[PDB]
Write a protein that binds this ligand. Structure first.
Ligand SMILES: [Zn+2]
Lengths: 160, 344, 80
DNA sequence: CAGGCCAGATCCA
DNA sequence: TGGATCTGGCCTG
């Protein structure tokens, strides 16, 4: 199978709806915690379901791409969008991105963000605010949603 | 008995219910902001100042060896007496509970410049489970200082928790804990006079006794008018805990405690029932081995406080509290929480 | 020339199958990206000296790697 | 048009 | 005269 119109209104299935502010982190987490709990619970399981007289089993691989830049910054334990560290895929500063502009590599991930937050909270090297931020590459919050590093085409086009 | 309005700076949207006001050498500070700390204040602690009824929340840096700590939304604060401050547990912004202990102290001070010092204390033994709304106080018995800890509200255990009831909360067991600060040890003790759980109560410390009164029991949806006195002695061997039930208690929950005079405390604000509000103040006069609770004069509340549903606050320390009333709607932003100060 | 370079670079991260219908464009994405970057840094020093948009950074550094890793960009977009 | 981060112009004890 | 204090600019929306 392959979806013919992946960006159409006919393929996205609603799963959880709420009337809450996007940046209101407390209620955002309060509402979205159960879904992430089920996601992590079923990421390593097998589903047996009856299909037309023959039982069949299902695996599941999840890719999170449909988040805009502000959502990624908020839910991946990152700073605001106007920070020195600009890209949610690599650990490079805005200035250094301006002098080089060509060569890079994706190195950010959810587990790496979690351990960077752990380092930030524990302060295991006895450093100040600036040194610790330079150590953690801009991580100052605990992420709670796992997404893959990807680019949103619509908002990329709008910004360009 | 004086009530006044205090304004806010440009950081009104940074005060949320469940904060904690911590005082050092007559200087009061803020803790428990809303949202994860931004670049404007990476430390997370704030400078609380009232001058001509106005608030400016200047940040406050930490020490080099300090550990940067998450915003606790319902912690348990203690005032140890070479001065330190104790906070244990509570809700983090992502709504998961923590079971670790943070110790506060003022590392150094310049001309109107303050730096804190945060250390993480790990407990071994019968570690209390993560919870929030609990109360922590300290006792001084025969040259030994050690703090007592009581139960509050906690999520279901990791074996009886479902996604459909992920955020459901049940009261902790009424076990009385004895946590040692200078050794990081705890011994769990069970006392027969304490059968039902208690949450969001107010506790008062003295020489060698703690008075826990009020509190909400979620098991039967009542607020008992209870009053327990806990006595601690420190022999060579294991410590002993004895609890006695005293008459004349009050039925309050999530109230605010502050000190007016020596051996003098006052309870201001709180909840009497689900839809009822504690509109009176109770003067609790402590002594050597006696307790007496009487009703003081009712302060003149404004219509905004009288017709609201939620207020919250903490202790300033110098005979003053800081209670908050929600203001207007949220979409119109700007002024969203009306803040008041009360003089005792 | 800058607009032509951008229009040549666009069809890679907007098509549901960039490995099939735009082979030459996908192969020349790197050359077009380098040309775009040098043109910005040379002729537009009044806008991109010490500051550049994170979306330009992404479009010039990370798009081909994401294409190789996933298979397509734009099918996973937020249009739906 | 709100919100956040940042390099630069005042400025005051 | 060296940190406080705004302040417009830039970034995502
Ligand atoms: Zn990047």
């Amino acid at each position: 199978f392959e979806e013919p119109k992946p960006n159409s209104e006919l393929c996205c299935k609603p799963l959880c709806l709420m009337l809450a502010d996007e940046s209101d982190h407390e209620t955002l987490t309060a509402i979205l915690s159960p879904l992430i709990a089920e996601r992590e619970a079923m990421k390593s399981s097998e589903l047996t379901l009856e299909m037309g007289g023959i039982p069949r089993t299902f695996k599941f691989i999840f890719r999170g791409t449909g988040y805009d830049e502000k959502l990624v910054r908020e839910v991946e334990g990152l700073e605001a969008s106007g920070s020195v560290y600009i890209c949610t895929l690599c650990d490079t500063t805005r200035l250094e991105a301006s002098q080089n502009l060509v060569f890079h590599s994706i190195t950010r991930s959810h587990a790496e963000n979690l351990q960077r937050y752990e380092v930030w909270r524990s302060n295991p090297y006895h450093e100040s605010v600036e040194e610790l931020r330079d150590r953690v590459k801009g991580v100052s919050a605990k992420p709670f949603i796992e997404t893959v590093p990807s680019i949103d085409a619509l908002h990329c086009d709008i910004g360009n | 008995m004086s009530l006044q309005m205090v304004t806010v700076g440009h950081n009104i949207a940074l005060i949320q219910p469940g904060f904690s006001l911590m005082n050092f050498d007559g200087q009061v500070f803020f803790f428990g902001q809303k949202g994860w700390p931004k670049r404007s204040c990476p430390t997370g602690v704030f400078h609380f100042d009232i001058k001509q009824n106005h608030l400016k929340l200047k940040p406050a840096i930490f020490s080099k060896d300090s550990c940067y700590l998450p915003p606790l939304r319902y912690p348990a604060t203690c005032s140890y007496k070479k001065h330190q401050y104790i906070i244990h547990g509570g809700k983090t912004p992502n709504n998961e509970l923590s079971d670790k202990i943070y110790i506060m102290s003022v590392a150094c001070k310049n001309n109107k410049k303050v730096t804190f010092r945060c250390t993480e204390k790990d407990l071994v033994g019968d570690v209390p489970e993560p919870r929030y709304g609990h109360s922590i106080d300290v006792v001084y018995s025969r040259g030994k200082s050690m703090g007592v800890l009581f139960g509050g509200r906690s999520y279901m255990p990791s074996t009886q928790r479902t996604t459909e009831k992920w955020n459901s909360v049940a009261d902790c067991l009424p076990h009385v804990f004895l946590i040692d600060f200078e050794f990081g040890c705890a011994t769990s003790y069970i006392l027969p006079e304490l059968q039902d759980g208690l949450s969001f109560h107010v506790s008062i410390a003295r020489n060698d006794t703690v008075y826990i009164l009020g509190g909400h029991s979620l098991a039967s949806n009542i607020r008992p008018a209870n009053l327990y006195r806990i006595r601690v002695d420190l022999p060579l061997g294991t410590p002993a805990v004895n609890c006695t039930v005293l008459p004349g208690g009050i039925s309050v929950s999530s109230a605010i405690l502050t000190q007016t005079n020596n051996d003098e405390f006052v309870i201001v604000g709180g909840y009497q029932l689900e839809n009822q509000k504690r509109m009176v103040c109770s003067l609790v006069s402590l002594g050597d081995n006696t307790i007496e609770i009487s009703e003081m004069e009712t302060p003149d509340w404004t219509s905004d406080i009288k017709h609201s549903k939620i207020w919250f606050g903490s202790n300033m320390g110098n005979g003053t509290i800081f209670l908050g009333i929600p203001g207007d709607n949220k979409q119109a932003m700007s002024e969203a929480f009306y803040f008041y100060t009360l003089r005792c | 020339e800058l607009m032509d370079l951008y229009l040549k670079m666009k069809p890679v991260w907007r098509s549901s199958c960039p490995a099939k219908e735009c082979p030459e464009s996908l192969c020349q994405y790197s050359f077009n990206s380098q040309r775009f970057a040098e043109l910005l840094s040379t002729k537009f020093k009044y806008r991109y000296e010490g500051k550049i948009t994170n979306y330009f950074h992404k479009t010039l550094a990370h798009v081909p790697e994401i294409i190789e890793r996933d298979g397509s960009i734009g099918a996973w977009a937020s249009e739906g």
